[PDB]
């Protein structure tokens, strides 16, 4: 019965759509999934944003309805990790203390340029939880979204 409007943000190619598709459809169209979080059936509505910047006023206003934000980087893409502050500031701006989860996606891949502590330093520094995920294997995907719910409430 309780609904959560979640927004997924991050650079081009980090796996925002993959995470959304993995959560909802269990694949590697619907933007809504019924989940059970700690015995309570919850409903997750997901906005899967674009990595490509369009400088759109109205896109910011659709983001504004979001209650929580997964900030996704890819662990083998340093530029995508460097982009993270821009997304956190983008979020705080459109929302005017916004619930957030740093997501390090593609943890299945061997060569990683961003280590766990380097990501977790930034996460503790912002005051937000951090989850490693793989849209490919589903590692930590439910954890990521279920943790964002816990962060909103």
């Amino acid at each position: 019965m309780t609904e959560y409007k979640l927004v997924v943000v991050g650079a081009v190619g980090v796996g925002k759509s993959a995470l959304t598709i993995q959560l909802i459809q269990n694949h590697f169209d619907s933007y809504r999934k019924q989940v059970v979080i700690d015995g309570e059936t919850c409903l997750l509505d997901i906005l899967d944003t674009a990595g490509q910047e369009e400088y759109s006023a109205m896109r910011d206003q659709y983001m504004r309805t979001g209650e929580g934000f997964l900030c996704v980087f890819a662990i083998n893409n340093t530029k995508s990790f460097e982009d993270i502050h821009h997304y956190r500031e983008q979020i705080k701006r459109v929302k005017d203390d916004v619930p957030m989860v740093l997501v390090g996606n593609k943890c299945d891949l061997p060569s990683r340029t961003v280590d766990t502590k380097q990501a977790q330093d930034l996460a503790r520094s912002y005051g937000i939880p951090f989850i490693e995920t793989s849209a490919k294997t589903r590692q930590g995907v439910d954890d990521a979204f279920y943790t964002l719910v816990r962060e909103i409430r």
Partner: peptide, 30 residues
């Protein structure tokens, strides 16, 4: 990829499903 409204007699569940599709559609057409 515009979603169609599922009807004036649509269930509340169906309207929620439609709302989430619209949210993404409207975001995308910018």
């Amino acid at each position: 990829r515009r979603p169609r409204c599922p009807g004036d007699d649509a269930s509340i569940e169906d309207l929620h499903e439609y709302w989430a599709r619209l949210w993404n559609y409207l975001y995308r057409v910018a």
